[PDB]
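Internal QA ticket QA-208
Title: Verify multi-chain structure generation after dependency bump
Assignee: T.L.

Test input:
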Amino acid sequence: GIPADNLQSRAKASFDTRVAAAELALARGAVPSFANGEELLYRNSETGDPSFIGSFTKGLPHDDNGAIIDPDDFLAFVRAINSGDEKEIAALTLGPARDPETGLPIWRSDLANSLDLEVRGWENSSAGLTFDLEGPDAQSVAMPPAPVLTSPELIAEMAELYLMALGRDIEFSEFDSPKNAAFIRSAIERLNGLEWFNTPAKLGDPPAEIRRRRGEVTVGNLFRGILPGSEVGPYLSQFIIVGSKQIGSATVGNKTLVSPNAADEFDGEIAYGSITISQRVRIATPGRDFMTDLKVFLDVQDAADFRGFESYEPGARLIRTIRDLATWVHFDSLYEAYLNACLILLANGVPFDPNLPFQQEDKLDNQDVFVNFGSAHVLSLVTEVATRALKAVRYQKFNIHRRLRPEATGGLISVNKNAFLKSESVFPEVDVLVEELSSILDDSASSNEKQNIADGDVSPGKSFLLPMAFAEGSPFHPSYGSGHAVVAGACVTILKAFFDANFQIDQVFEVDTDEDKLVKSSFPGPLTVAGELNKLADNVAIGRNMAGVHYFSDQFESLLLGEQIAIGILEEQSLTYGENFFFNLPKFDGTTIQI
Amino acid sequence: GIPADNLQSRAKASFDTRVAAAELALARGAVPSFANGEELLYRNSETGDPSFIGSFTKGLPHDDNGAIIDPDDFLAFVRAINSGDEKEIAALTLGPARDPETGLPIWRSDLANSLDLEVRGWENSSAGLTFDLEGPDAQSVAMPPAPVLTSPELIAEMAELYLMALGRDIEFSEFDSPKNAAFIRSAIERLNGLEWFNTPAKLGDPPAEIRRRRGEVTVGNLFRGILPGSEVGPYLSQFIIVGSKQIGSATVGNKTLVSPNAADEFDGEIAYGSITISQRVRIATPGRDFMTDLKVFLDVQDAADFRGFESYEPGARLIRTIRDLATWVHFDSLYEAYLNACLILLANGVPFDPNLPFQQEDKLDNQDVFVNFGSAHVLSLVTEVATRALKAVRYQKFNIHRRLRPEATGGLISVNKNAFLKSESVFPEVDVLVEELSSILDDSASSNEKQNIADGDVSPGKSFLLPMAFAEGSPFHPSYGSGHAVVAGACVTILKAFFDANFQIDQVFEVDTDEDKLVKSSFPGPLTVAGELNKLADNVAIGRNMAGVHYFSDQFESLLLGEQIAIGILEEQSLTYGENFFFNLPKFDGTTIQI
Amino acid sequence: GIPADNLQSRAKASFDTRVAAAELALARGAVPSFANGEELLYRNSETGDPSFIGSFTKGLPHDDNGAIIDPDDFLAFVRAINSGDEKEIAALTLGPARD
Amino acid sequence: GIPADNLQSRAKASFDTRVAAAELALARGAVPSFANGEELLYRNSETGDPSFIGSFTKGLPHDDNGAIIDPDDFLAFVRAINSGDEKEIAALTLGPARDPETGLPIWRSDLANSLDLEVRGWENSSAGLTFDLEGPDAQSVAMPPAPVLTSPELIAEMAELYLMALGRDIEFSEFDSPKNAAFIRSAIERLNGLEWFNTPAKLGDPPAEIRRRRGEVTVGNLFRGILPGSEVGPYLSQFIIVGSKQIGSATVGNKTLVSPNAADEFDGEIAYGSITISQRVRIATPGRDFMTDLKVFLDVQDAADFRGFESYEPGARLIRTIRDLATWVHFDSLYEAYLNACLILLANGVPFDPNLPFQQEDKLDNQDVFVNFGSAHVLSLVTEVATRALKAVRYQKFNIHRRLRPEATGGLISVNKNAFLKSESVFPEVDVLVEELSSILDDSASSNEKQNIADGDVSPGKSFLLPMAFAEGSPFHPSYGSGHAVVAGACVTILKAFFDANFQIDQVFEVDTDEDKLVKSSFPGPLTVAGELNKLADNVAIGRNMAGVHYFSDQFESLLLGEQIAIGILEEQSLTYGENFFFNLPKFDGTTIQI
Amino acid sequence: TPAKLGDPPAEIRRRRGEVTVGNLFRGILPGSEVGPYLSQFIIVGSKQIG
Ligand SMILES: [Ca+2]
Ligand SMILES: [Ca+2]
Ligand SMILES: [Ca+2]
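Actual output:
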């Protein structure tokens, strides 16, 4: 007989497709996650117990030097993370001692006590235990060990964050302007004096380190990411400052119609359906930074809820300063930047990936696209990968590495350096970190003294704390990896698969140095969609660093993790279509995968 | 021994969760879809063949009376829909005869020939064959048979659409104003003269008909939907006209901060992260309707691509007229309205469903929400259900019912009534539909004569065509059900499950009758989130009817279908969480399901 | 009892040997193939479309500079490669214009 | 829903294709193999034990009459065959008594002792237990029982073999020449005096016997096989004597190019890529036959390793005599003849089977062939079937029938006839065989006496042994079936499926009677590819008979077994292609199967 | 110039160094650079029957 296949009922074929996808996912294998070993390394000299200084302990009661008071509070917290039991999380110790009549926390700072602040809790500390109906399971993927406190890498990461905090009110369009030369030149020479940047990796180093190690800092790569496309052209992705084509501009047969609102494109207006999105961001008070006083910093480490304490100027403007990019990433919904990028691309008519079905003229294939392979498809797909990626990064954040946020590291530096001047030893583990950042810390103590004077906040010693752009500092979850960066990675992977990513963009804009408007850039162009989508991912991720809440390595590693999650979802979803097609996807490493 | 369970590796538990969800879906069963029987009922008197006049045939070559020329073109189109083969879809007959030198279509109207229009193709005619990794399979659910051309129901649906087209430039806030009394009163008395509205269902009628049958028309229910909440208060949902709370307004312990941009709330500004969405919509030229001339209408039925031919006024305004709601639903991304509603709810601090985990103060449960049970969760979930719902409605649209769009029905009415005045019989099947709409058709012929004069479009006879708000008329896919309404249904089901849906809204706004601004309504309130989310679903769905592209029954039935799709996804996803919780969901029928 | 193995018919043993080898091959895993990214990188200046100058296009109609005339001819070629359908291969454009 | 099939991962589909093939093979069923019953029939008069005279016992110690000395040696040998255990094989008794001082075997003949010959071992006695990844398992197929020593069929087979040995230096082209008429006519007459050939089968005879029984011997069928095509035209297949078209001969559009080496085609040069294969074979010394002396014969049955002892004339020539065909099959690689034919067919441009995919002009199908359905595919397939066919004949040879080689049967005849001349009875079971061959034996004793005189070998009595063309006689494995003929059957089956087997060959060549060159034959032609490929299989298989190492029945039965093995491989491999096609295969029985 | 740390491993494995007459136009499989350019197996004959 002739070899054949049999049909089955529709219901059974649907069931079998779901199982087959599940089998695909199971066959990929699971990789183990290794942490850097710091967790139990650092010990308390007096008791011999682990001090947990290189670990996330925000929320647990701390002592005056910023170390937790009771190691059992951290060990109970870890057990709670790994079980996910709601009652167990409710029995944890959160916040400082409470007053017997008020029942309210007793804070160290006059500021926190005068506001009657209450405590805030951990955000989804067991989201990494949750399964998902599509994509790689959260625990099946891994991020490599984070940099340790005594490494050249961390030294360079902290130097870069302190300089971003001192240069927060510098305008992106004026990086090469004579008014900022003293700061820019001193920033670059200080970073180029650190071994991470001025010496190459050595044979024998871990591959993950070799891939994220950076070379010589220049004005052209200062504070930028390293995804392909991020170092070409202006700092800011076109997609976070320009508008789109507007309703009313169309080509109808041989006639060209011009929208009566066409100028909105060049004024940061994205056409969103029949309404609009404005790219202008709220303006946080220039020059006002937070958590520059030791007692307020310790209250925030002990959970004081300072959310919502920032002050703003009236109006809005196109992103101008480093601070505005920090403000943008303080409140964005997590797929916001990529959904807005997508809307510009749809409104501007950028073509879909030419390997998708039915992209030719309708006269050749009789089939337009929308639900599948069209705008509705990409609009749901870019947003749905976000929670799958977050589940994976929550497993890394809480269940595996528990890396301390940058503000805690600045806490360790401030305490050690102040003890040193009083001829005392506190946190000897950061002695080399403090010695190598010495000229940077002198500038920061002087900037923090002005901030503390202006706020009327007094604490003993100089303050070498890292100035935060946000009143509450970082969110209530560990630093490695990052929710913004994991989502960026997954979302721009979907968009580069769905759109013709190498299509060129010929109009390059930047924000004017004098007015709140867009001007033609001096960079000729063209740029490609892929490089400006990669740039946008880097802008949102590095924005979190500019706010003081992540390190470089958190961002870069999380971008790669989100990329894997997105690729995994597309592969499993490929079993559902009967058409003959594939997604052409340019990865962050420069190679292409066809799915 | 003591009875127990065993653990398994994480990978295997993830695989087993996916299979278990697949088994849940398989156990729900699949229901058959029945069509109304019209497809092959209507015959051509001369050949005896099926004429397909009650079927969607947009794109296939039509004769001068609007009937397809060759029945085989429709029969080949059906085969192509059911196979999904790309080459088979490419071999179909699309558009009219082409000119041998140009290769361009030969149109009937001077307008289409003067623009050199080309053809447009069908949009995803086989999307209903696609499987999905989550939720009910597209073919496992059903929509009941659509109303037939000779039924009282269709008569009332067409009367309502012609009156919406004549009242397109009437303002929602002026429905009860003396300047519109002659039109409003005549609209209500004519609709109340039709049996659908003035006589109740009879024992023995199909249950689906009894559920969507409407009673007496009044100013308070005129042009409204029937979801619970839609008939209370102002016509327009608060969520499509107001803004939200802005960044800078916060309560920090005992101190209340006021945003310097707080007034933006009351000016239609939604806080979107740190940027904004404006609720003001583009303004289509008032009084300009389309496809009111027979030859241009036949060219559009033969696929002439008129997309992008509308003209607009400069600027934007809060939705004011029926036409503006049509313009809003011409270009919205499909989950746009619900994502914007969600952003208002998050920015205003409306509480999440109190049965979700960790909603108490952090001091009682030590756990904030974001990834799971928080904003990121609902923001991905509301958008991801959209493509699952569209797959189901595409199966109904193309594979089962293939209902003709309202413009084709107006085509049948115009041809029959013109033949009748010349003592001739064309399409006798609509004789009763034409007789019962007689006074309405007199008003419409007079409005269409003015439109055709203004455009310089000439065709023999009077024009009783349904005026379209869009130059191209309906999209290139059948009328029953609707993509907008199926998505509305699924998306507001997710939001009413995730948010505390019965929470009350005490500030009720409407659009001012004199200026482009929001004013306090005369309706006292309060309203609930569920009723205003249901209203919003009805506003977007009924907006498609106001544009002339759907009937009432298309919308209502599609809302119920999307609701089922959403409930199915939530049930399957409930197997992934280890927490103890459930979604409390108020359905469109007034009952609650806990998931 | 003493641990043992059982014999089976020859035919079964032959069947089980072929299945065991298929299982060994399945257990090796499958690795993905990544391409260098050139295919869609190079663009035609006038139209903005991919020019495919870094890709095999032997057989498709070329212009006087050696670049393919129509990008759709390459895209249809790639679809036909991935499906293997004989009729789809036969409908491709091969060679220059004919007399 | 619409019935459907689901996709699965590539890996999973490969795994299910291999399982499906295995299932196909299991579903064919396995047939038992029946032997002829002789193994244990013959008994030793003195002890009553089985004597094993009708079984292969080469290698086991024999007595002076050629019977094994100890029956336990044969029974241990059978156990070793069935287990395959290497140690058990190593513990068997091989060769004669050895000298305590030298360790060397003690032989009977001066010749073997003077050369210090060592023993040679059984070749792969348990290759019939090996499984395979493709095709019918080796024990799943069967050959029918072999002819018994006292049958008419064996009498006929031995008469033919003795006549082949006496005619070894006769030229194929001079079969009907007056110089050979005394020998040819007496050969025909003596074969036509035997019942097997002069009397037809009778109703009730086993069907396998009816199919291989031959009729009246003529010059046209003398020494030929019975596959369709072997009796048409010249004795030797064109593929073992002609060369092929050479590089440089081609048609390029309208221009015909002629190779500068075109004449090579008619001089026996096959184009092998860019180098050549010569059809001229080494020339074994004319008139020199082996094992014509009783003692040397006994040493050979006792394992004396005489391999490599033949002498040759300088140079090479196109196959000319029966001896040259025997020389050809002495050392050929087992698929050599069929690969060489395949190369001739590819170089001459014979078409592939027209039912294969893509064989039309490239302008009609856009697809040339090579890997699949082209030259690389058939080049690997024709050679890979060889080891699968050998495993099955190994099971037949050792595990089932264990048929004595023709040389052993000649030893029985010689011993019995000499005992009779001396008034003694030895091996009474072959009395009838000896009586019916009486005239042939007289000629053979006379030729054997000349051979022994020329070699200086002396043994008591006349010699009626079967003169061997090879010094070592047969290979170290049983006679039924044959490795050359099982491979011939499988390999030509593959070639007839892959090429257009009925294409005609119009140029027919033969080897010249006077010179070493090809001449146009007197047979007009045409011949077909199928007929000449079947003829080639018969030429190689009957050349083994010409050497004295096989009987007729061995070859014909093995050709049928090889055919089945090849068919089973094609059927299992048909599950691996997605194309629509099939192999048209003309079988040895005249019918065609489509796979 | 040699490969650099950070380059793809597949590139490091096939990168070739300084060209000499001894390696000109040769492959890099072990044994290809020893002795004559052409393998013995593409020029020599074999032992013959006899
Ligand atoms: Ca298209
Ligand atoms: Ca809480
Ligand atoms: Ca061909």
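Spot checks passed. Residues 1-595 of chain A form a domain with the Vanadium-containing Chloroperoxidase; domain 2 fold (CATH 1.10.606.10).
Status: verified.
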